[PDB]
Ligand binder design. Structure first.
Ligand SMILES: CCc1c(NC2CC2)nc(N)nc1N1CCCCC1
Length: 154
């Protein structure tokens, strides 16, 4: 049992777009944009929808760069997060009820104010490698187990 989610990183040669989640799940951490995939939309549809809702941005092409499965102890559904990246965007990012967007230089990623797993898989993202990840959490701060590999098809 899995539930589908999306995550979108706008990564340009010298900068990456992150949003400070302002409420709800993951509040207080920088992250890419995304969320639950709804019934009746593809995963990539959901990624585009969440990006528009959370930043106002639309994109021409999203690229599948990773998949990360998360277990939280005591939670019955695994989280199957599909990670997309894009370089080209359409528009200027603007704040939403959910997200406060900012550009970060690639050597100034705020890892200590991001999900703990990002420290592990974000470099592969930055090196433009495709990857499969798995992280077991207790609560929101403690990774108990993890696996991470580069793959050829996401
Ligand atoms: C919680 C999953 C999660 C995460 N996983 C760690 C297990 C805690 N890392 C990062 N960057 N984003 C995550 N989300 C992006 C998709 C919507 C849900 C939050």
């Amino acid at each position: 049992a899995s539930r589908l989610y999306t995550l979108v990183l706008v990564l340009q040669p010298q900068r990456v777009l992150l949003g400070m989640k302002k409420r709800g799940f993951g509040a207080g951490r920088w992250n890419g944009f995304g969320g639950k995939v709804q019934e009746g939309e593809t995963i990539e549809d959901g990624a585009r929808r969440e990006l528009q809702e959370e930043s106002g941005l639309t994109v021409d092409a999203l690229h599948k760069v990773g998949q990360i499965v998360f277990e939280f102890v005591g939670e019955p559904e695994l989280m199957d997060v599909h990670v997309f990246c894009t370089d080209s965007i359409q528009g200027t990012p603007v704040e939403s009820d959910e997200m406060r967007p900012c550009w970060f230089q690639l050597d100034q990623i705020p890892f200590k104010d991001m999900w703990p797993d990002d420290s592990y898989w974000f470099p592969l993202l930055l090196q433009k490698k495709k990857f499969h990840g798995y992280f077991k959490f207790q609560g929101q701060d403690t990774i108990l187990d993890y696996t991470l590999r580069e793959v050829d098809t996401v």
